[PDB]
Amino acid sequence: KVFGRCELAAAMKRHGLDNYRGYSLGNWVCAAKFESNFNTQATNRNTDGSTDYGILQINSRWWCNDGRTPGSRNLCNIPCSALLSSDITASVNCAKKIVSDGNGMNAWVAWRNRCKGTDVQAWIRGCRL
Ligand SMILES: [Cl-]
Ligand code: NA
Known part of the structure; x- marks a missing residue:
């Protein structure tokens, strides 16, 4: 599924991400934009053979099992x-x-490089929450 901007903000807000660990909603939406372009089906392989999965590009090296990242958690x-x-x-x-x-959120390279220190609130402007 490819989320719309405000659709995802609402879904994220409903699942408790607004100000989670002090990160406003705009940060999570910004991160999702640049990690996956709001596509739940996004995958990308890394050089060490691990793979990043989904809307927030979570890495098989530490976080999930894909059966093909030997010695991972x-x-x-x-x-x-x-x-x-x-x-x-x-x-x-x-x-x-x-x-x-x-x-x-420094764990997400795209957030670090493209969202951090920017006006992330603009990512939820206009949305009904
Ligand atoms: Cl922090
Ligand atoms: Na793993």
């Missing part, structure tokens, strides 16, 4: 395929664990 305890669902619940619950692990 599965810290969210889910098949990576569950991160591709049109239901973003699994992605959100796993992201909550990632953002809590000490490094905040």
Whole structure:
């Protein structure tokens, strides 16, 4: 599923991401935009052979199992395929664990490079929440 901007903001808000660990809603939407272009089915392979999955491009190196990343962890305890669902619940619950692990949203390279220190509120302007 390819979310609309405000559709995703609303879904994210409903799943408890607004100001989660102090990150306003605009940050999560900005991150999703530049990680996946709002596509729940986005996958991308990394050089070390791990793969990033779904709307927030969660990495099989640490966070999920895809059966093909030898010596990796599965810290969210889910098949990576569950991160591709049109239901973003699994992605959100796993992201909550990632953002809590000490490094905040810096875990998402695109957020660090394209959202951090910008006016992220513009990403939810006009939306009915
Ligand atoms: Cl933080
Ligand atoms: Na893994």
